[PDB]
Design a protein around this ligand. Structure first.
Ligand code: A83
Lengths: 99, 99
């Protein structure tokens, strides 16, 4: 749908069979989730943010359902203080910015 | 207008008489800009991000022009690696998310 920004754009996601909440984050190239139980293999990774860097695990071709819209793509897992849906998956769901 | 997210949503801003580029960042409550020459008074501040915290200066009722739309509101200044337009100003310009 349409979503205004007077509040945090928080949505429900399903990933790895689990239900979580996450932020629609146009300022994120990438999707980064708190430590979770994800099946499979993964390669080590570093990502930058305000405040410095975190080390994360990069899983590829992960299926994730975002507010009812499915996507498959990279999901990084690690010590992020907030679940973040980044542009790699926002594009897949047809999400746009309008003003 | 409308803006898709296949690339970073970077826009031109004018603030303090200067021209800069910034990210339309739905994942930011607040607007945070690199160190700049802003007129006036300001109170000390801390803000959190991925990676940890940064100390910033909080200027209030700052006028800023964002891609042609004017807003007045809080602008935090500090060691952010990227100029960030947050929800406090995105709401003022009628920016929404759509999918
Ligand atoms: C390669 O791929 C990527 C690389 C980098 C990223 S990123 O680091 O997450 N990122 C870009 C970054 C360089 C600015 C996307 C951005 O949107 C994150 C989002 C973010 C927000 C919070 C924490 C980590 C990251 N973000 C927002 C802010 C500004 N501060 C707050 O909004 C802000 C808002 C709230 C608070 C605290 N308020 C509160 O009461 O509770 C919370 C902690 C839940 C916010 C503090 C700062 N600082 N970081 C993403 C992907």
């Amino acid at each position: 749908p349409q979503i205004t920004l007077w509040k945090r754009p928080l949505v429900t996601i399903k990933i790895g069979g689990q239900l979580k909440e996450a932020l629609l984050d146009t300022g994120a190239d990438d999707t980064v989730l708190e430590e979770m139980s994800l099946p499979g293999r993964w390669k080590p990774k570093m990502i930058g943010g305000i405040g410095g860097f975190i080390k994360v695990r990069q899983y590829d071709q992960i299926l994730i359902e975002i507010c009812g819209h499915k996507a498959i793509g990279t999901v990084l897992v690690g010590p992020t203080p907030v679940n973040i849906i980044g542009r790699n998956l926002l594009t897949q769901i047809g999400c746009t910015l309008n003003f």
